[PDB]
Amino acid sequence: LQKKIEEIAAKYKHSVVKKCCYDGACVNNDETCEQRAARISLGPRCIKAFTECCVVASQLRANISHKDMQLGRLHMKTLLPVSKPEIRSYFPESWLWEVHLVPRRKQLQFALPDSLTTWEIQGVGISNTGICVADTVKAKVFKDVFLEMNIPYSVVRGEQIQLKGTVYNYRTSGMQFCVKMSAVEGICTSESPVIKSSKCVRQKVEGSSSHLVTFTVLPLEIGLHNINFSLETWFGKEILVKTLRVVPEGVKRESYSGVTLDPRGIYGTISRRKEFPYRIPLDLVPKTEIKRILSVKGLLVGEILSAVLSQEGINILTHLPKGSAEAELMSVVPVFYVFHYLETGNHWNIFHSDPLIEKQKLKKKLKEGMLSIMSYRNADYSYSVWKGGSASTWLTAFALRVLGQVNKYVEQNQNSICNSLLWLVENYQLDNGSFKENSQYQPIKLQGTLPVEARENSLYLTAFTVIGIRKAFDICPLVKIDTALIKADNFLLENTLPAQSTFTLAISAYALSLGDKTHPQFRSIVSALKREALVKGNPPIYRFWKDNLQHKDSSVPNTGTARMVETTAYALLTSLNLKDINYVNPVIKWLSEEQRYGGGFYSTQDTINAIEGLTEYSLLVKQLRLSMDIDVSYKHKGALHNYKMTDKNFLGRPVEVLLNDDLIVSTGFGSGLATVHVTTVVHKTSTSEEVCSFYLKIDTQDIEAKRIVACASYKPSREESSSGSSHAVMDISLPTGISANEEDLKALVEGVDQLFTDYQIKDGHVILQLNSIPSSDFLCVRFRIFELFEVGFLSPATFTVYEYHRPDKQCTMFYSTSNIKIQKVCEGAACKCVEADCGQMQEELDLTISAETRKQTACKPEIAYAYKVSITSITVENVFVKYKATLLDIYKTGEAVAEKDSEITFIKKVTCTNAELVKGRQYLIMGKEALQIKYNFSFRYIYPLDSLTWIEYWPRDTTCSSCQAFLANLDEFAEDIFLNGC
Amino acid sequence: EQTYVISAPKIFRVGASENIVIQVYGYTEAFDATISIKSYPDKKFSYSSGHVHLSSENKFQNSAILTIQPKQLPGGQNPVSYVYLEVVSKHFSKSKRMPITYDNGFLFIHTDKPVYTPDQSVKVRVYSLNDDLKPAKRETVLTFIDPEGSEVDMVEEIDHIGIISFPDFKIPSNPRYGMWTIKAKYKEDFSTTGTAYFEVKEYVLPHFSVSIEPEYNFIGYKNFKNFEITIKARYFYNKVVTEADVYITFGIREDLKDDQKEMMQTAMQNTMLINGIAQVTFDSETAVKELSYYSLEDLNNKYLYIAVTVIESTGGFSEEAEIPGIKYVLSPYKLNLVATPLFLKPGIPYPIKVQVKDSLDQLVGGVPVTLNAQTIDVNQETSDLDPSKSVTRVDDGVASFVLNLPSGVTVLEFNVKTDAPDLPEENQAREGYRAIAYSSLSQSYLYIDWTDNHKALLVGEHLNIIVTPKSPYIDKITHYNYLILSKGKIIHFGTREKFSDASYQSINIPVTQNMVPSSRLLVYYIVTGEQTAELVSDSVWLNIEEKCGNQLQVHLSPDADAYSPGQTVSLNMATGMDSWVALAAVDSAVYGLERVFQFLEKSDLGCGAGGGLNNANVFHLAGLTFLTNANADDSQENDEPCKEILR
Amino acid sequence: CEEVICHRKLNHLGERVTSGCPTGCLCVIREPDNVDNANGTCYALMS
Amino acid sequence: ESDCTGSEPVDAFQAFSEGKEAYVLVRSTDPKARDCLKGEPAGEKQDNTLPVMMTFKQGTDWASTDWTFTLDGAKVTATLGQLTQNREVVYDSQSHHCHVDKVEKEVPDYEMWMLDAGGLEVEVECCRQKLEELASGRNQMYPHLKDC
Numbered sequence A: 001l002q003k004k005i006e007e008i009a010a011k012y013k014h015s016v017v018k019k020c021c022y023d024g025a026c027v028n029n030d031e032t033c034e035q036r037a038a039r040i041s042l043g044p045r046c047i048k049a050f051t052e053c054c055v056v057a058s059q060l061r062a063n064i065s066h067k068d069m070q071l072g073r074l075h076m077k078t079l080l081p082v083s084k085p086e087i088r089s090y091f092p093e094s095w096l097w098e099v100h101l102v103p104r105r106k107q108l109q110f111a112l113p114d115s116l117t118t119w120e121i122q123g124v125g126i127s128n129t130g131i132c133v134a135d136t137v138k139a140k141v142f143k144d145v146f147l148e149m150n151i152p153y154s155v156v157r158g159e160q161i162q163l164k165g166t167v168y169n170y171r172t173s174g175m176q177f178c179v180k181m182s183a184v185e186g187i188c189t190s191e192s193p194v195i196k197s198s199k200c201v202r203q204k205v206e207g208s209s210s211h212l213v214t215f216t217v218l219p220l221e222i223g224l225h226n227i228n229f230s231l232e233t234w235f236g237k238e239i240l241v242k243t244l245r246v247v248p249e250g251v252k253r254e255s256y257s258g259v260t261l262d263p264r265g266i267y268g269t270i271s272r273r274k275e276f277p278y279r280i281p282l283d284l285v286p287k288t289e290i291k292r293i294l295s296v297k298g299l300l301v302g303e304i305l306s307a308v309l310s311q312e313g314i315n316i317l318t319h320l321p322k323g324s325a326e327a328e329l330m331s332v333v334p335v336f337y338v339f340h341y342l343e344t345g346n347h348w349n350i351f352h353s354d355p356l357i358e359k360q361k362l363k364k365k366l367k368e369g370m371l372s373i374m375s376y377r378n379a380d381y382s383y384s385v386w387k388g389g390s391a392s393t394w395l396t397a398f399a400l401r402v403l404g405q406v407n408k409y410v411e412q413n414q415n416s417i418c419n420s421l422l423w424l425v426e427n428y429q430l431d432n433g434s435f436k437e438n439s440q441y442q443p444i445k446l447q448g449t450l451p452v453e454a455r456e457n458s459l460y461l462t463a464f465t466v467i468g469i470r471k472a473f474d475i476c477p478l479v480k481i482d483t484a485l486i487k488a489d490n491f492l493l494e495n496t497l498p499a500q501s502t503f504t505l506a507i508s509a510y511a512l513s514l515g516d517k518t519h520p521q522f523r524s525i526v527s528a529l530k531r532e533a534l535v536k537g538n539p540p541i542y543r544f545w546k547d548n549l550q551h552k553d554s555s556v557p558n559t560g561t562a563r564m565v566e567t568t569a570y571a572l573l574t575s576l577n578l579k580d581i582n583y584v585n586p587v588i589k590w591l592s593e594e595q596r597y598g599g600g601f602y603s604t605q606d607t608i609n610a611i612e613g614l615t616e617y618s619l620l621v622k623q624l625r626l627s628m629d630i631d632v633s634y635k636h637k638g639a640l641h642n643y644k645m646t647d648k649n650f651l652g653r654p655v656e657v658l659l660n661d662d663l664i665v666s667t668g669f670g671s672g673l674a675t676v677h678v679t680t681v682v683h684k685t686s687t688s689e690e691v692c693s694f695y696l697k698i699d700t701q702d703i704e705a706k707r708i709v710a711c712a713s714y715k716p717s718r719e720e721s722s723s724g725s726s727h728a729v730m731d732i733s734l735p736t737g738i739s740a741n742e743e744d745l746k747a748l749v750e751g752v753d754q755l756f757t758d759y760q761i762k763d764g765h766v767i768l769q770l771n772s773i774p775s776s777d778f779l780c781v782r783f784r785i786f787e788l789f790e791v792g793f794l795s796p797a798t799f800t801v802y803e804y805h806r807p808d809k810q811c812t813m814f815y816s817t818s819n820i821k822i823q824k825v826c827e828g829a830a831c832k833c834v835e836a837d838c839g840q841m842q843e844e845l846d847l848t849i850s851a852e853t854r855k856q857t858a859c860k861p862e863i864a865y866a867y868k869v870s871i872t873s874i875t876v877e878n879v880f881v882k883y884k885a886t887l888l889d890i891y892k893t894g895e896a897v898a899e900k901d902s903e904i905t906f907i908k909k910v911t912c913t914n915a916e917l918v919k920g921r922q923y924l925i926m927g928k929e930a931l932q933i934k935y936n937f938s939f940r941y942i943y944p945l946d947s948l949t950w951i952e953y954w955p956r957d958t959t960c961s962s963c964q965a966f967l968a969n970l971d972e973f974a975e976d977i978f979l980n981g982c
Numbered sequence B: 001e002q003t004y005v006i007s008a009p010k011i012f013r014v015g016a017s018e019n020i021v022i023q024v025y026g027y028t029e030a031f032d033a034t035i036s037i038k039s040y041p042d043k044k045f046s047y048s049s050g051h052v053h054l055s056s057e058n059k060f061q062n063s064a065i066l067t068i069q070p071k072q073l074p075g076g077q078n079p080v081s082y083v084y085l086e087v088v089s090k091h092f093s094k095s096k097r098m099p100i101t102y103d104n105g106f107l108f109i110h111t112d113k114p115v116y117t118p119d120q121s122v123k124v125r126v127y128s129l130n131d132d133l134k135p136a137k138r139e140t141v142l143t144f145i146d147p148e149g150s151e152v153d154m155v156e157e158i159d160h161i162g163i164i165s166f167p168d169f170k171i172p173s174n175p176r177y178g179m180w181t182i183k184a185k186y187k188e189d190f191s192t193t194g195t196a197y198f199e200v201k202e203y204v205l206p207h208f209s210v211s212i213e214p215e216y217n218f219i220g221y222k223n224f225k226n227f228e229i230t231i232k233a234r235y236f237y238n239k240v241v242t243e244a245d246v247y248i249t250f251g252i253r254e255d256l257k258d259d260q261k262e263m264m265q266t267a268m269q270n271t272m273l274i275n276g277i278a279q280v281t282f283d284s285e286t287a288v289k290e291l292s293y294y295s296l297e298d299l300n301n302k303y304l305y306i307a308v309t310v311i312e313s314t315g316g317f318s319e320e321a322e323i324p325g326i327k328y329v330l331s332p333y334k335l336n337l338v339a340t341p342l343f344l345k346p347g348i349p350y351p352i353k354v355q356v357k358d359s360l361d362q363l364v365g366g367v368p369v370t371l372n373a374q375t376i377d378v379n380q381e382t383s384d385l386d387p388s389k390s391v392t393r394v395d396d397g398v399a400s401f402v403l404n405l406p407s408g409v410t411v412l413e414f415n416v417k418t419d420a421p422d423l424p425e426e427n428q429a430r431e432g433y434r435a436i437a438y439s440s441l442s443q444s445y446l447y448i449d450w451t452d453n454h455k456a457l458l459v460g461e462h463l464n465i466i467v468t469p470k471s472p473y474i475d476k477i478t479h480y481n482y483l484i485l486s487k488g489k490i491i492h493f494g495t496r497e498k499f500s501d502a503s504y505q506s507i508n509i510p511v512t513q514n515m516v517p518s519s520r521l522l523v524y525y526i527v528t529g530e531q532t533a534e535l536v537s538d539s540v541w542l543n544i545e546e547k548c549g550n551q552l553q554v555h556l557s558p559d560a561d562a563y564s565p566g567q568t569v570s571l572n573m574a575t576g577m578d579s580w581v582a583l584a585a586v587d588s589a590v591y592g593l594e595r596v597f598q599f600l601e602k603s604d605l606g607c608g609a610g611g612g613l614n615n616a617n618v619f620h621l622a623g624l625t626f627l628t629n630a631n632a633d634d635s636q637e638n639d640e641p642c643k644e645i646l647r
Numbered sequence C: 001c002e003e004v005i006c007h008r009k010l011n012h013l014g015e016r017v018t019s020g021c022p023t024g025c026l027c028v029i030r031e032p033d034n035v036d037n038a039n040g041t042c043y044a045l046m047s
Numbered sequence D: 001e002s003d004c005t006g007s008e009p010v011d012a013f014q015a016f017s018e019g020k021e022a023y024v025l026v027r028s029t030d031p032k033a034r035d036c037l038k039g040e041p042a043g044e045k046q047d048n049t050l051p052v053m054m055t056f057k058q059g060t061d062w063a064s065t066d067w068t069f070t071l072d073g074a075k076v077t078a079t080l081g082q083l084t085q086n087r088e089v090v091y092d093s094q095s096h097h098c099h100v101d102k103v104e105k106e107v108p109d110y111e112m113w114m115l116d117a118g119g120l121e122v123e124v125e126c127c128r129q130k131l132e133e134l135a136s137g138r139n140q141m142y143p144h145l146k147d148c
């Protein structure tokens, strides 16, 4: 067995292809050797070494022992790999890093940092007598007995969470102690506060060890709730302040609304008022607030200015994951465009403090941001999309664009830029002038058959590379790459028309606009691009572009996408390079209103090109004086607030809109041009009415020697080939208390037979990225999972896959890692937390209910509605239960009205048993509030079943034995309620 | 017969205040002399010059400080390599070609930590001194080179106080992992460089902690058959790992700097981690019979690399640990000479002070040492001396010897060994040495030695040196002459009266702060008459206590063995004189470093413990060039400074 | 500005000096930035 | 440019995108044209009639009135309660992005409607040419330029 592996290792000890044999021999019980080698893109020798070592390793692993397997992994794991710099411990930041003038004697007092650390204080004196390294003095901050608690990132409302912790005792002698928990209102605990924070049960830790801590809680309210933990011992008392983040059920969905304020109509029609209506979505999670933030900034560029200058974060594309070098460049995009605005227009007086220090800070952040991509650069100065992956023509072009633009304000290394440009033009430019891609990275999915898709992608890549080379040409103005630019420009000129898509037409037009703008064929391309223009209004208030050609698709989109903003941005930049000022104003208005709170847009490319369009337009037109009285108020409610926007302050902080009324933003006569964006965040219970561009399936299995298997497959659009999607993302939300095996994920990306190109675990999410998801078959990620802490009433999680550059091509699906049913009953006590906030059905035919308590409960000012219904249908949707009922007799209506004998919907949390309703039976139901939805073309009302919702079974006949009297008093109350009007 | 001696550093240092000594003899009437550094070879330009007066009031000895200004030298294509040292007077005019260096000062790069993780910021400052160990106040350029060889950042800053604070270097979110280099340099005039390193490593969450404890830090002859290794492992919640699988692989390593190692697939022994602790024994002999080696005579100064993998049984998680190398040690002792020049003076007893250290370079006491020696005279007639034996002084670690050789001896090949009662003959320490006789055409020799060197010289005390000449022409020597050098600069010089009523006479030298941390003393007398004047010289190296000129001391009030988190504490800084102080507070765990006093005495152009094959070699080994009308026969191509020899 | 070989070198003060290309070309070094003594090729600059 | 002949013959239901989209009034010779007038389908197509919700703005107050359209080929008989209004779509763009209505009265007014979502600019310009031809020099109102 050793010699059978000694031969293998000895064969590939100094082999050119050595890694392929190594990760060929790795265990993969889900795919054959040929299926794994089918993904190898490093040549035939790597495929043959991989296949050999894979087959031999699979034959040797038959009927093995654990010691034999581990010894084999010892033989392979040492001789073939090299090494990797990594550290298992973290070191806190140093401090006291200061210089002092010491007149022979100087004392300075401070506070030691909060840490268990042996600090080492080192002094170095400098004087006219030389240098003196003082004796290093030690300062050990140490705690012998201390508690720590492990609080999860988030917890879904209703889940019963076990909070685990540990008390540490480093003293050699054991001791008594007790930890107690701080009871907050929203957090429901099984026990009850004594005097108000839990109880002290004295336990003992043994000397030089630890003791476990557990606290079961059940959050009833959404939001961040403070929880304290007290550790008490005969030697003191410690308080640990903590925070539990409670998240609603269902999926988060985010909609955006944009409005441009032009009070004097300088760039278009006058715009002084706008009304953002309050509309409740269809599948809204019950007892959850509709969140919406209001952001009113000063200029077209004000949102990006606020994003960079307000350092509370921040990424303008947080919904897209890191991993690709594109993300590292996008991190420096906003700082660059802000700096370009402030420097080119000389607007440093916006700062109330010293402008020179602010220009310093921005220059430093710009340099630091520009360094982020250096990891993805290879020795030959090419760039790779994935760290350690193959060099990409596309990404090298993009890096040349960002670097070439940044070089204006932070000078770049000319020799490096030269080597990158020459790597492009010397290797991956064909005779016809086009550029070809080296790697398998597919940034975009285009239409047409395989040949037509090839032509389209070739045109797109050539234009993209041309943009990159043009943006960085002045750094390294070589005659060779100018000749390359000429050949590529010729290819674009000859091959753009006839167009196959507005997207490639636009990017080709913008690439050619960076060169000779007098060529006739370029003018023809600009004409063809103008022919595809869409307008809102006549005379047009808006002008934008759809990425599909008109002769292929005549329908007009109702909401924007990334391709829409990117095509419109390319057309806008082409027009700006042509100085076509009459044509861009409605385009600028459309891109400005399509912008998002934070400054970004839908994906990365549309974001950078739209930011360049807005900024370049802002620098090209006259800067108007800014003076508005902006008042935001609710329609049928109080005035929210108002502020006077001037050039002094115009990046004001956002404001949360809490009330459920329609919002109204208005201004009087003003000077300037402000932007008003509203971001709405809701949580929905369903995803059925969303267009799915992927077939999804996900399951949990038991394995031999629990595991999640998540499969996706691409659904090609119209005229799209079966080649598969472009750069894709598989985001798997993990349920509460479920932890993923990171080794399984590493094994799927680190090898030459990689299935995925990058992975990460962020905030309870397993985020994988991919070059392409197939259309022909399913692709599955498989990774083991384990239970970190115990969770009861586990809320389902989500499985989302989408195209990185087309987040609109997506599909979201719910799943649960627990099979757990049934939900029959909660049995007595240890129960008040589950049944805390939901309704309890009255006792069946209970005659002790005294008709006046049935009226006083109905006439309660808290109780909004109260009437008698008949249930028609039961339905179970995800985490909730919906009851279709008929509204029979109305007894009270405080807020909106519903019609008699109309269909009324009820909703209760599925995790509520004592409110079990039987289909076909009548019930008297009284409660608070409702939801008014617009379904089809009419209204609909949905009523949640919570606490203080009085429900009672109501038979229609009178053969219920003694319930003849029951219905007697029931109809007594029912008769008395409407004849009085309390 | 009238003579003149011009003493200068072996090499001129651009921008340095170079002190030039002139000592003339035989002159009774006063006269002036001009010392000058001019351009080579035309002497059209005078880089600097000074006038010195020589009189009976002056004892016909004087000094002049010259400076080659950096701005006075061209830049770029055809830079200056040589200058002319020139002395002109009514009596004589002599010049010499002197090489120059553009290395001036010291640049110490100080980063807060040596290891960083992504998104951290590297705090970095530079301590900048000129050649005279004073705040350079020169603008400085910092360069950052990543593990892939790319220069990713450069920043220059002016220097006001000798401490240069630079902006923090932000490590990227996804950086290049590995060894980063920081390079400090002066923007103008000089070629001085500084260099520091810091690693950027990727953080990986560990499941548990694994510790390896070898029986000893070195492997001797007693543990060459069995070497105990204890492998412990515990969870980070302060509990011992109950059951796990321990796999241990062993390798042979050349040096710890190179990450190359030769594994041994024969000693892959596997054991069980039970209740936190496991133990194995490594039979070195049997395992190193693999990969050749075979014997313990080999493997000496090589290392034993140890690799351990621990696989916890409950959760199946695995964690690794490694010992980089345990040096195989053939002899528990290492020998080195102390304050014994390898040069013989015919007629003077030759002393040999051997020194014994352990594997930690610590002075081992009570160690017997045996000294053997062979002698070769002018007739090539070899003679084997009778062996001698001393015991290591336990007060200073010294084992002293004194040797009486015939006057005609020329070469002394002496060998020293340790004589431990419990060591085999192979495991003893052995060192060989060769000493050559000083050559003089007048059979004239000089030997200096200052009472004795234990303890080391403390600033403020006094150095009572003994000057013993052996020669004809003894009772016609008028005086003795001396030059004291420190840190590559002549700090003192002078002349003492020779007593006609003795063979030796004590010359007293007050040891001053200028002599920290080391100095060199050259003493010579002039033999005159017919033929040509002769300089008879000797030199010694003075190791002096490392004492700061402006001593810094930091203390923490209150003083306690341990502190509590968030505790308000006061730090007291005390200096001898008004001084700047750069402070740092670093988690010591980063170290698992720098010593300035040793890197500072690279500017000493002398080598060895003193002495020389002849007068010119004595001056050369002391870091001196000289101009003389006396005999100046030196070796060939002797223009660069000496290089300290290694063995 | 064609196949003229150029050189990256250190001068007597430690500064990086590049030489070998005639007027109108640029020296491109395909080595890492930390290679002191390197060889490169000249490329024609625009005008 | 191009030729503006589109959608022959003119069908009102086709000009209304078969009741799947909303249209906004952008030009009208009616001096009393409601500001920010937008018509959107308020129900399904039952028989020859079709519910149409009309939103508009009076001052700073938004209002909405329900109407019923009776479609007969190119003619549309709109009505609300007792008020009736006769219209005939006299032109419809090739992609049904905009159309030109003719309302009947003593002085027949002409209106231009277009998709609220936007339309192809060449087709919108064609509808504009048709409306300028029919209006023949009369003053046009632009209800969508009323700060909507």
Ligand SMILES: *[C@@H]1O[C@H](CO)[C@@H](O[C@@H]2O[C@H](CO)[C@@H](O)[C@H](O)[C@H]2NC(C)=O)[C@H](O)[C@H]1NC(C)=O
Residues within 6 Å of the ligand: A182, A183, A184, A226, A227, A228, A239, A241
């Ligand atoms: C959890 O502990 C924090 C820290 O002590 C409490 O915050 C303090 O509350 C007291 C009143 O109870 C105030 O007088 C202090 O000013 C608060 N300090 C801070 C820093 O906020 C907090 O009230 C505790 N929470 C619970 C639920 O007991």
